[PDB]
Design a protein around this ligand. Structure first.
Ligand code: HEM
Ligand code: HEM
Ligand SMILES: O=C(NO)c1ccccc1O
Ligand SMILES: O=C(NO)c1ccccc1O
Lengths: 703, 710
């Protein structure tokens, strides 16, 4: 018997369960587990040696193609990191969530359950010293290296998750291997980096199953772009990956494939699918060796469409010299002919991709360099700054996509200087509101999904953040200019090697403002402050890549972009999850911010108080007062007005962001707590703890 | 774009989320929040004073019928506690989950959103000193008391939840007011206290909407019984409750009813059912579909309902909407009742099929007759039933808080006698512990006995547990799963040890069989761990007493009889739900997280505490030793499993003979989340971790019913 909660009845229901995942770390590992220090005890070279042995250790329950598991593990690794989307930074190898449903049962992940199982003995051998996440990427690397290609490098540090990431919308499809997110090649549903559900990037047979290489290329380009890869990286990755292995399909899988892992019998112990997708054949003459075979086969010969016995589309070589030029995967006394997918032909038919592939063939070294770099990025893009990259194989070179941070070449401020700076900030002409908005704009770009954003680095002062509409550029410049004057003033007055960064000052200023707002309400609060943040420069900032962090809805500032799809409150919850907030923390934060008044354009939306810049629970008290009736504003699709029953007296204006806390059942229970006559101090303390939490999200230093 | 989980793709998936709920306590309230401690500060009478005032303080947005909210609050309280099922003890007002979906949106709870909103000002005034759950029940009490009827009392102590309970599978039907749980009135599905999902007990118009009083009575008796109420109680509650208020519905019972709370526009702020006849518009109020009061004085306590029911004849009728109701056949009642809003208008009393059932049914009739001839007996059984109804899931007397708690401890409360002696000290606990290990009892015996004792506890209605040692009493001493003959042997030895100890004290120190049972289990686990090379000191908290048959309602404890027990690998060969689904359900009653459950099962298998000493899931060569052998062997890819709820584990090579297990053991290597946990405990560096986790889980289960010291 399976219960039908309020998530299966009404679609327009907020999914607060995603925030509940932040209130607890499920799993048997101690809640204070420090994976980093455990990984440091790991003999990485010994793990690689075991993986090397495993590569050619064909098991009977699942014999290795060509006597080598390398290709299978590369696909495995690529699938693990392939779900990444720049829109929210979700997906990616980070937590090894591929091991859980629904991802572990997608059609495109067929038989990856076998690959992972082959690694079980190694995982058990090293235990907590190496995560599944790290181990899967490491297997990919060893496969590539064992087959003749030295990788760019490798870093451990990916902590294992013990449940699926519920906060991930994979698409509007109720079915797998089918799509309903695009009509024209190059216009898929915004955000998602895949053109088809259950699929990773695009349809292997071509757009909508049609063998149109040119149209496929447009989808490939758009989707890889949403996975943070450009033309050169994309071409290098596809060509590089398909230099190895083959496609599996001895007939039609739609009629020769078994129950996916999640639907398989208990006796199958987590394994399922016991022909993956009709298409059959290798790309090159030597599927287990790094060479120029893929590029040569594609460019040097003409290819044409062909429907296999399963009805699936693949491409065959017009030539006859390539006929039976490839040994069979399991039958020695047999041969096979190289094949190509519509997505491979796309790389030759598209003018831009063709130019890249021609240069690659012309300069084999350039192909290697691009594949190496792209493979390293693909598998480490969601690990955050260099500080999180661990182990002896971490490259000495830091890549710009890691959003690097410089070293603090000076002594850090102490308790005395911290109080001094705090005092001078509040004594300046900066208001509590300016300080809070600036600190929020600096810290709120952080996302726990791929660990990008955050106040460290003070990139708020650089492009593109300094000019984002939501940050109100003109007003932002005033606050940053003033804090920069304070920084100069402090640094020049130091008698020793002590200095303060602008990154720290912005956060210190926010803390001071919150402390001041609480003092105005009669509460004495001291927010813990941790110095050490540094200021990153433009040369170490990939401006365009930060566009992904630009918010469409910002609850704290009551900001809603003019053209959004889903309800404002849905985006708000999605955004709250990126900041690792629970439902109560999200509520305390919004409610308290409204009493302060930190709205974009300084509007009074949701500011249900007559004493601005005073941290109280007035937001809740007034929101819950039945003496007020709410109604949509005439000729306004964002604003709502609170009128006080039916007397008409217009008191208060608000958006859906504010009203959801009095409408959603669970949020209303939290609001009723904060809106009680004995909860003001409780709200103040919860608001401060949440503010402090957000300010320290990118401080992986202390862990 | 709603991110579907996995239930939409694989409906028969394990609902582990119910266990994740035990891993954390969502909500703003502090981690170490002690509601009991807060309620104790509350000025109860002051709250009752404000509620009494509220009863007649009509609010513009939802005026009180007859100028009194009393009836509405009684229904509200009735609905808060009416979802209780004895099968799992879930439901009931305990956590006030009525405020959350999907319950707050059941057609049955129409406009109860308005009732709760009316109490919001009072909730804000007293804050955490009184929970929504306690406040809703109190409002019901005050309503009854303010209308002329005195209650048996009231007790606080219901802590508020901040999310719905993902555990209660309210109904198999994927739609409201529809049922696939019964074809013939009286044979409703097993595990439900309602005849139709979305409903509390039965259909007001009769089974499947047919005005059949006889069949209706059969469903009423069955559903109420599943909610722990007998004929007398059932009739008292229905008659007592319908003595007040009226039904709402002068138009179509399915037309004016606006969107449910969960679907209402954001500006409505949680209030739904935009009915064209309930909020504000002087006149006819509507909720259900039938219209008209039961008595002529809807806001006064009297014999009106019973008198009006038995003294006159009633006939079925398709009112305004097709909804069945019963009207009098005499003109003596025509226009005899004042309108709910317009006193210048007259209204005629009506009856529901469920009301007539109390007349048409022979057993119920004898009750109603006795009631009419003995008002005192009617009001008395109503008071008792109302008290039990609203306090059924509160647990033992120790949890009943406040100045209005009846001095009388009810048998249904699973009473516990006080300790009339001094508690044993750290030195005696050591001597007794050693003496236990020096007897002829094995580790398996001591572990199985301690488990059978503490495993009856369920967090739902706070019933069961090791305290009281009811394992030695009926009916537990004879439950098949406890292996009576074998249990008796163990109880005999421990009792002798109890007799010798007590009769050797040079003061007033004594030990209970209950404490020795738990102490014996701790010693056995400690020994098993020692047999594995680990030194552990399981915390022990003396104080458990021995309850007698006088403190035990035997028939009621049968509800705690397990159909499946993972720890002992016991599976009743006649269950409908998969074994693993029941295992997770039971694990949730023990407040376990997925990891705690996994550690507990794995550890128990290494010790070998199976029912009938079978080798099911016992993947180890060193029985009575606490290791991670269960996981190491479970993850062995060299084994191929196949059906025998038994399965056979075969070695990949050749044919041969190997392991055997049940779905309970195999699910830990099949389900994705459980397998991930199993992989941790089955790793080379996790044996000690598993031992420590097992011990911590064992200790937790052993003290689940310890409220006596909170
Ligand atoms: C436009 C994007 C892509 C498409 C449509 C595509 C698709 C496909 C298909 C249909 C298969 C066969 C699955 C099977 O064995 O039955 C396969 C496999 C394979 N793929 Fe891709 N792929 C993409 C990109 C990539 C990239 C970026 C890499 C890694 C850098 C990679 C690496 C591999 C490897 C090594 C294999 C062969 C595995 C084996 O023999 O077992 N793929 N691909
Ligand atoms: C066989 C079980 C029962 C059935 C089918 C049923 C029936 C119904 C229906 C259809 C309504 C009208 C809802 C509306 O339009 O306002 C109502 C209300 C009412 N019920 Fe019951 N009921 C049962 C029992 C009980 C019990 C056990 C109690 C409490 C001791 C109770 C208490 C009340 C009160 C006080 C009202 C009137 C609410 C008012 O004026 O606002 N009920 N019931
Ligand atoms: O996209 C794939 N791999 O990258 C894929 C693999 C197997 C079957 C269908 C697919 O779409
Ligand atoms: O009990 C009820 N109201 O109090 C009730 C109301 C509607 C349908 C079924 C029911 O049991």
């Amino acid at each position: 018997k399976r219960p039908k909660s309020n998530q299966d009845w009404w679609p327009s229901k907020l999914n607060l369960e995603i925030l509940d995942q932040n209130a607890r770390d499920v799993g048997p590992v101690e809640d204070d587990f420090d994976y980093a220090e455990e990984f440091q005890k790991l003999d990485l070279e010994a793990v690689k040696s075991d993986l090397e042995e495993l590569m050619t250790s064909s098991q009977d329950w699942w014999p290795a193609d060509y006597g080598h598991y390398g290709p299978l593990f590369i696909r495995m690794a690529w699938h693990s990191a392939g779900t990444y989307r720049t829109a929210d930074g979700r997906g990616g190898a980070a937590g090894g969530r591929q091991r859980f449903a629904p991802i572990n049962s997608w059609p495109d992940n067929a038989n990856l359950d076998k690959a992972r199982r082959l690694l079980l003995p190694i995982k058990q051998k090293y235990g907590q010293k190496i995560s599944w996440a790290d181990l899967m990427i490491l297997a990919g690397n060893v496969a590539i290296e064992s087959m003749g290609f030295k990788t760019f490098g490798y870093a451990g540090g990916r902590e294992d998750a013990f449940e699926e990431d519920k906060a991930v919308n994979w698409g509007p499809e109720d079915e797998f291997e089918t799509q309903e997110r695009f009509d024209e090649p190059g216009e898929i549903q915004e955000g998602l980096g895949a053109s088809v559900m259950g699929l990773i990037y695009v349809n292997p047979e071509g757009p909508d199953g049609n063998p149109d290489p040119e149209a496929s290329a447009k989808n490939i380009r758009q989707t890889f772009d949403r996975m943070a890869m450009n033309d050169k990286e994309t071409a290098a990755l596809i060509a590089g990956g398909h230099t190895f292995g083959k496609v599996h399909g001895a007939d039609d899988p739609e009629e020769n494939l078994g129950p996916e892992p999640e639907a398989a019998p208990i006796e199958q112990q987590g394994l399922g699918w016991q022909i993956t997708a009709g298409i059959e054949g290798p790309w090159t003459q030597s599927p287990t060796e790094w060479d120029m075979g893929y590029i040569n086969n594609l460019l040097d010969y003409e290819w044409e469409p062909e429907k296999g016995p399963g009805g699936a589309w693949q491409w065959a070589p017009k030539s006859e010299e390539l006929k039976n030029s490839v040994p069979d995967a399991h039958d020695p006394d047999e041969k096979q002919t190289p094949m190509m997918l519509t997505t491979d032909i796309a790389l030759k038919r598209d003018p831009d991709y063709r130019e890249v592939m021609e240069t690659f063939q012309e300069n084999p070294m350039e192909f290697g360099m691009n594949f190496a770099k792209a493979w390293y990025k693909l598998t480490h893009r969601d690990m955050g700054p260099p500080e999180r990259f661990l182990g002896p194989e971490v490259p000495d070179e830091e890549m710009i996509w890691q959003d690097p941070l410089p070293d603090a070449d000076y002594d850090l401020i102490g308790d005395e200087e911290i109080a001094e700076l705090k005092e001078e900030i509040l004594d300046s002409d900066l208001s509590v509101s300016q300080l809070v908005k600036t600190a929020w704009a600096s810290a709120s770009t952080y996302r726990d999904s791929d660990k990008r954003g955050g106040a460290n680095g003070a990139r708020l002062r650089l492009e593109p953040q300094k000019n984002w509409e939501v940050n109100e550029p003109e007003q932002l410049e005033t606050v940053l200019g003033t804090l920069e004057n304070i920084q100069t003033e402090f640094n020049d007055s130091r008698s020793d090697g002590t200095q303060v960064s602008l990154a720290d000052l912005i956060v210190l200023g926010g803390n001071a403002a919150v402390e001041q707002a609480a003092a105005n309400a009669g509460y004495d609060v001291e927010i813990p402050f941790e110095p050490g943040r540094v200021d990153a420069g433009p040369e170490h900032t990939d401006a365009p890549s930060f566009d992904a962090l630009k918010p469409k809805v910002d609850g704290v500032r009551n900001y809603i972009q003019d053209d959004i799809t889903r309800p404002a409150e849905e985006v708000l919850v999605d955004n709250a999850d990126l900041l690792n907030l629970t439902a109560s923390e999200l509520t305390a934060l919004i409610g308290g911010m409204r009493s302060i008044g930190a709205n974009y354009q300084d509007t009074d939306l949701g500011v249900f108080t007559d004493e601005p810049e005073t941290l109280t629970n007035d937001f809740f008290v007034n929101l819950l007062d039945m003496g007020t009736e709410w109604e949509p504003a005439a000729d306004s699709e964002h604003r709502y007005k609170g009128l006080d029953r039916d007397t008409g007296e217009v008191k208060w204006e608000a958006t859906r962001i504010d009203l959801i806390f009095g409408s959603n059942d669970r949020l209303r229970a939290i609001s009723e707590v904060y809106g009680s006559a004995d909860a003001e101090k409780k709200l103040v303390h919860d608001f401060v703890d949440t503010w402090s939490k957000v300010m320290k999200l990118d401080r992986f230093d202390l862990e």
